[PDB]
Amino acid sequence: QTLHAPHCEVGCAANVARRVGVDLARQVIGAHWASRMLVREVGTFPQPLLDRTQVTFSAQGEGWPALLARMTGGEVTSRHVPREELLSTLHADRAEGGTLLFMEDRACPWLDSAHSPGMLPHVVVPDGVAPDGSWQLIEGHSWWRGRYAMSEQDLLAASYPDPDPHHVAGRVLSLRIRPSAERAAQLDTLARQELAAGLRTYLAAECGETETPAGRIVWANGPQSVPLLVERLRGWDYLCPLAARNDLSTEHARDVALGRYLFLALTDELAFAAYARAGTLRLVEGLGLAGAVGGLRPDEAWRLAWRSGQKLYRRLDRQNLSALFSALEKAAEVDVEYARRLLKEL
């Protein structure tokens, strides 16, 4: 019953969107076609937060907050809220959509993470107070997806942790996104027009960079994205021989852990691509345009890349990396043909 997605904030957003009659995965995510390599690397000195060269992939494009806001005519706003205002802010957001509430891994008993706040904060969707007086929390990540109960006292404690490494105390993302009735009746039309726009951005194949205290950030869009991603990721072929060694220094141990994490985080983005492409296919079907693309399945191609990423970060075997590269090439090739034929009919 609970919706979910490979990124927990996206699954959370999907549940809020459904409250107001919006199918996030089909009409918002699925309507935003995108493909992008991102790199963080040495730029202009000094960059004190640059800890390592880092590369990943994204199919999020402009991201669901921008898309959801303009498609519904609403707003997606991050704020920090005082403890005395939290419950009333949740009830006020609820009348118009909902709230993404940030909180540490260790505050959520179902995550079984009492020992650590996580590398990044968790997010949940409050679902009002049950008749028995407990608050309900919706979990948007697929692995733990579901609804959970928490006392009002535990909820407020969870929202204002001390210490607060992630700086999530009172942090709410408010989704006030209830469309007008006429807008809601038109949503598929807006999704169709967003669909064509993202396809044009993708074929435009723009790119850029920006110098930040955490390094130079480089991005490249479009058909070029996955070839450039593969060429860059080749640089991590040292991971498997290094991981195989048993004379590892503390440094080389960190090298392996962070290299594995690079590929774990990449794998979550491959999963998101699979999820978003499947959304695009459902959108296209409902729009009557499935004849345009003639059986091409970018959703399955990215699902294969996803599985290859899982095997790689789990095992770091010698040939897992090349298998991942093969799967990505195939997904890149399906994507470009799918996009070209779909855009022709739009």
Partner 1 sequence: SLLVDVLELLRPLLPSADTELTPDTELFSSQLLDSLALEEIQAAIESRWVPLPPEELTLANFNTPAAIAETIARTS
CB 204 within 8 A of CB 33: no
- The footprint of partner 1 on this chain (CB under 8 A) covers a number of residues equal to 21
Candidate residues 118, 223, 227, 286; the one interacting with ligand 1N2 per rule CB under 6 A: 118
112 binds ligand PNS per the rule CB under 6 A? yes
- Taking CA atoms, 309 is separated from 23, 175, 220, 305, in Å, by 28, 33, 21, 6
Residues 217-256 interacting with ligand PNS (rule: CB under 6 A): none
Closest-CA residue to 280 (of 194, 211, 172, 167): 194
The span of 109-117, 205-213, 217-225, 292-300 binding ligand PNS (CB under 6 A) equals 109-117
d(CA 332, CA 264) in angstroms, rounded, equals: 20
Shortest distance, CB of residue 38 to ligand 1N2, whole angstroms?
A: 17
Strand positions, DSSP E, 274-346: none
Residue nearer to ligand PNS on the CB measure, 123 or 199: 123
User: Strand 215-221 to strand 135-139: parallel, antiparallel, or no bridges (unpaired)?
Assistant: unpaired
Residues 146-185 interacting with partner 1 (rule: CB under 8 A): 146
160 is in an annotated binding site: no
Shortest distance, CB of residue 123 to ligand PNS, whole angstroms?
A: 12
Secondary element (H or E) of residue 176: strand 171-176
CB 236 within 8 A of CB 256: no
315 binds ligand PNS per the rule CB under 6 A? no
Size (the chain), residues = 346
The span of 78-86, 239-247, 305-313, 329-337 binding partner 1 (CB under 8 A) equals 305-313
Report the partner that residue 120 touches, choosing among ligand 1N2, partner 1, ligand PNS, none (CB closer than 5 to 8 A by kind).
Answer: ligand 1N2
Angle of helix 250-286 versus helix 187-204 axis, rounded to 10? 130
Q: Tell me, residue by residue from 134 to 173, as one string, x for binding to ligand 1N2 by CB under 6 A and - for no binding.
A: -------x--------------------------------
Burial tier of 63 (Cβ tally within 10 Å: 0-12, 13-18, 19+):
middle
Q: Tell me, residue by residue from 268 to 287, as one string, x for binding to partner 1 by CB under 8 A and - for no binding.
A: ---x--xx--x---------
Instruction: Please give the angle made by the CA atoms of 47, 50 and 54, to the nearest 5 degrees.
Output: 140
In this structure, what token pair is assigned to residue 323? 């298998």
The span of 110-118, 128-136, 269-277, 330-338 binding ligand PNS (CB under 6 A) equals 110-118
145 binds ligand PNS per the rule CB under 6 A? no
Phi/psi at 259 (5° precision): -65, -45
**2 Cα distance to chain centroid:** 17
317 binds ligand PNS per the rule CB under 6 A? no
Candidate residues 89, 113, 136, 142; the one interacting with ligand PNS per rule CB under 6 A: 113
The span of 19-27, 62-70, 118-126, 299-307 binding ligand 1N2 (CB under 6 A) equals 118-126
d(CA 207, CA 39) in angstroms, rounded, equals: 12
The span of 111-119, 193-201, 321-329, 334-342 binding ligand PNS (CB under 6 A) equals 111-119
- Taking CA atoms, 130 is separated from 13, 83, 92, 108, 135, in Å, by 21, 21, 17, 18, 6
313 is in an annotated binding site: yes
Residues 3-32 interacting with ligand 1N2 (rule: CB under 6 A): 7-9
List of residues contacting ligand PNS (CB under 6 A): 105, 111-113, 118, 143, 314
List of residues contacting ligand 1N2 (CB under 6 A): 7-9, 105, 111, 118, 120, 122-123, 141
